[PDB]
């Protein structure tokens, strides 16, 4: 690929993961090599090789991968190489990459390399966009921060021990074991405020323990608050659905609604929540841009509505307006979509389910069954008001989802379009 999209490229987000891994190596190993004596002259070559590899990944990021990133100017994707390079150079991310790239044998002199954190945030945003149910990763991400803090805490503790000598007091690290898991254990017992450690004796130890416990209280609070936000966001829709259903049930209980109607309402609530995951789709529809809302309505219902013979030859925007005025209504099994003799005022478009037209002697006979994508009752739309009555009983075989356009919305659309209005009146007087 001559030009790569920073948003939708999987190879680019893999390279972002590589840059994040290099940044993580810097962030997690600079305090280790500064505090712990793990940076021996005997194994210095491994540290130098991996530092060189991380700096090489940084250089290939600043030079090769970032300068080829397409960007948005004036709402337009810009893939011109000079423009991509200028957009990268003008950006603050290039400044951060340069500030991290400068060298400034001491492990702390590599502390500028930790400044390439914008790659981490970009990779986090890409991970949140790629996978649904992202809060789980967020938990891991939060846990990662906690681990890193403990890591930092661990290193600090070792330095404190190294500042006082190993084993000089009971508070400092004694000098036995791996020397990192002991200091990480101290960091766990302190930064989670568990306690149980040997008590600090000297003033330096008491100050360190005080500050450590204070940072631990606030870091534990950060972890708990992050998990609380994760739980509240994960169950927010379920909580809203439960609250709406409970409010409805309380309303019916105050007005002594019988168990049959209450059970039907609960059944509709449960079926709607399990099927479409939201109680009302128009609430989501009004939040969208008008073009997005219009194109979604087209993609859902335009072929079916334009297949109807009643609206043939009509203006396309009037069709689009009827699509926008369609309302999704879920009918329970054995529910009457049209009652024999009731006023016909609505157009029914079966989005899902089956609809049975009843007839014959004594009723209870299925004349015809209409599946999804079938339209009935559109003739009732072209009526003067009270001029249409439903001729046959029309019943819902199961939970059927119908897109309904009533006569009032059709008239409100039709007053905008005189040509389609005249055509519909001509068809109405022609069919009779």
């Amino acid at each position: 690929p001559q030009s790569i999209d920073p948003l939708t490229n999987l190879m680019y987000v893999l390279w972002l993961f590589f840059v994040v891994m290099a940044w993580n190596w810097n962030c997690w190993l600079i305090p280790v090599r500064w505090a712990f004596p793990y940076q021996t002259p005997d194994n210095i070559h491994h540290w130098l090789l991996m530092d060189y590899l991380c700096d090489l990944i940084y250089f290939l990021d600043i030079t090769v991968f970032q300068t080829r990133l397409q960007f948005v100017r004036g709402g337009d994707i810009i893939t011109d190489k000079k423009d991509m390079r200028n957009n990268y150079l003008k950006s603050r991310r290039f400044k951060m990459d340069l500030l991290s790239l400068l060298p400034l044998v001491n492990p702390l002199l590599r502390l500028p390399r930790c400044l390439k954190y914008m790659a981490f945030f970009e990779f986090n945003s890409r991970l949140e966009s790629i996978l649904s149910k992202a809060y789980v990763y967020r938990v891991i991400r939060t846990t990662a921060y906690l681990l890193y803090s403990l890591h930092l805490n661990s290193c600090l503790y070792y330095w404190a021990s190294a500042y006082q000598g190993l084993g000089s007091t009971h508070w400092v690290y004694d000098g036995v074991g791996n020397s990192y898991i002991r200091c990480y254990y101290f960091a766990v017992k302190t930064l989670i405020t568990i306690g149980g450690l040997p008590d600090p004796k000297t003033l330096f130890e008491i100050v360190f323990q005080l500050l450590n416990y204070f940072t631990g209280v606030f870091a534990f609070s950060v972890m708990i608050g992050q998990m609380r936000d994760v739980v509240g966001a994960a169950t927010a829709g379920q909580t809203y659905y439960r609250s709406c259903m409970d409010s409805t049930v309380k309303y019916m209980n105050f007005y002594k609604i019988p168990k049959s109607v209450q059970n039907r309402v609960k059944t509709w609530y449960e079926y709607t929540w399990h099927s479409q995951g939201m109680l009302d789709e128009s609430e989501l529809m009004v939040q969208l841009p008008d073009k997005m809302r219009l194109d979604l309505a087209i993609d859902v219902n335009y072929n079916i509505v334009s297949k109807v013979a009643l609206f043939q030859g009509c203006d396309r925007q009037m069709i689009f307006d009827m699509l926008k005025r369609l309302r999704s209504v879920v009918y329970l099994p054995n529910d009457y979509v049209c009652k024999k003799g009731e006023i016909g005022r609505e157009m029914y478009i079966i989005q899902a389910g089956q609809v049975q037209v009843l007839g014959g002697p004594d009723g209870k006979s299925v004349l015809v069954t209409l599946k999804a994508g079938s339209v009935f009752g559109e003739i009732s739309l072209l009526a003067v008001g009270g001029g249409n009555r439903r001729t046959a009983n029309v019943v819902a075989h199961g939970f059927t989802n119908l897109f309904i356009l009533d006569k009032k919305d059709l008239n409100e659309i039709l007053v905008h379009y005189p040509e389609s209005q005249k055509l519909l009146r001509k068809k109405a007087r022609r069919m009779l």
Partner: protein, 456 residues
């Protein structure tokens, strides 16, 4: 074929009946794998319970083959189609893996190793389903959520207790101060003491409480660090779930009090009088005390037209049919008019209408008593009880009426009154589809006025 409805009570009962072996496996399999005495001493009981659990697992696979699903709003009853739907799901693979006959590996490993039954844990999803279905069926969602969270933490603590006992066994009992003590001790060699002390250690670690003997070895240090991190996640999950639940229970009071505070700020902002402020505060105290804070339009807004129509019919149809003008109206017109009724609530002493006000709506008393009072308001001509109505002539807009959509009486709410108003505009909008019924209503109003003499 006989098909179990997943929304039915039979499916929920079977979910409980399969959850019992899943919970039994998820706890006792690791308990017997880590505590050798628990497996060896009650071996006949464990074999019987494992056989029962396996039988229930087979019956659960059979139920899965006999469980219908909603396709195009219809419960599928074809046996081949249900079988294919089950087989295409990952749950069929997990159920097959959970019923792999690993109990023959006993003859390869002896009775010491029940870890071979760990694959039974792959029925876990069934367990979860039952609990979430309970969360949709119970009348105490927060109490059940607390119980479910507590049960999950108890199972995780029991698992960590088993892990700690196994790690102490691997290192050696009594070898150092961190591990479980020597099992040749008469007190610590008891199986109950083994499990209960391991549970004590696991509770203290997974709650990030500590106060346990510190690790002595690097492997113990690693395990203690990792297990306190797991405990950090567990503790954060417990506190976050309970805080989210508390916020959910307090959300209604929070929004009600926020609205009350905003209204109080408005009355201090616009310098509303003190008596009117007291009236508003008394009104909101009445709302919260009587659980009338819900807005009926907001409560019923999500419901479809048919279900809202059914609820509204069951609330208002008898008292709207008792209306003289609406006595002979068509059923569909009655449904539309009932759907167009808007709830109004009046405090004691509130005037619903006075002589000389424009009458645009018809009030129907759902609860409460109203009084027809004179200009002073001290005396009362007649008290209208629940189910009574007034203003039916005003909404008709009869030509030649001396009143001319103006109230001829003073209606005062003696106590708190829940009325339902039917406006003239809503009546005419409902009458758009019923021209003959509109003409009949106008004729009824005209004849009523002629009997009263108001028509000229």
């Amino acid at each position: 074929v006989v098909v179990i409805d997943p929304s039915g009570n039979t499916y929920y009962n079977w979910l409980f009946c399969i959850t019992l072996p899943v919970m039994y496996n998820w706890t006792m399999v690791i308990a017997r794998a880590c505590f050798d005495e628990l497996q060896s001493d009650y071996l006949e009981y464990w074999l019987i319970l494992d056989y029962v659990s396996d039988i229930v697992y087979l019956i659960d696979m059979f139920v899965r083959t006999r469980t219908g699903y909603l396709e195009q709003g219809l419960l599928v009853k074809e046996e081949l189609k249900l079988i294919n739907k089950y087989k295409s799901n990952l749950q069929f693979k997990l159920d097959v893996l959970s019923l792999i006959p690993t109990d023959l590996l006993y003859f390869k490993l002896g009775w010491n190793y029940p870890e071979i039954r760990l694959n039974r844990l792959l029925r876990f999803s069934r367990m979860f389903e039952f609990f979430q279905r309970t969360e949709t069926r119970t009348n105490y969602p927060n109490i059940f959520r607390i119980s479910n969270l507590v049960m999950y933490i108890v199972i995780i603590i029991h698992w960590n207790a088993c892990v700690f006992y196994s790690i102490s066994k691997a290192i050696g009992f009594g070898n150092d101060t961190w591990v479980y003590p020597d099992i040749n001790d008469p007190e610590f060699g008891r199986l109950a003491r083994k499990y209960v002390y391991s549970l004590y250690w696991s509770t203290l670690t997974l709650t990030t409480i500590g106060e346990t003997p510190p690790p002595v070895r690097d492997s113990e240090y690693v395990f203690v660090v990792v297990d306190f991190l797991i405990g950090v996640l567990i503790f954060a999950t417990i506190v976050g779930n309970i805080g989210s639940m508390i916020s959910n229970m307090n959300a209604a009071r929070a929004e009600f009090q926020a609205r009350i505070d905003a209204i109080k700020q408005y009355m201090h902002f616009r310098n509303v009088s003190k008596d009117m402020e007291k009236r508003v505060i008394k009104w909101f105290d009445y709302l919260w005390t009587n659980k009338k804070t819900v807005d009926e339009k907001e409560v019923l807004k999500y419901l479809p037209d048919k279900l809202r129509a059914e609820i509204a019919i069951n609330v208002h149809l008898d008292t709207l049919k008792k209306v003289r003008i609406f006595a002979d109206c068509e059923a569909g017109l009655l449904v539309e008019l009932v759907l167009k009724l808007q709830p109004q609530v009046y405090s004691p002493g509130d005037y619903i209408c006075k002589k000389g006000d424009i009458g645009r709506e018809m009030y129907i008393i759902k609860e409460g008593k109203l009084a027809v009072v004179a200009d002073d308001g001290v005396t009362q001509f007649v008290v209208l009880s629940d189910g009574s109505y007034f203003g039916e002539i005003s909404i008709l807009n009869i030509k030649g009426s001396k009143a001319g959509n103006r109230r001829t009486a003073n209606i005062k709410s003696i106590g708190y009154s829940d009325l339902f108003c039917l406006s003239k505009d809503d009546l005419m909008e409902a009458l758009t589809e019923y021209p003959d019924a509109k003409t009949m209503l106008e004729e009824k109003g005209k004849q009523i006025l002629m009997k009263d003499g108001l028509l000229d």
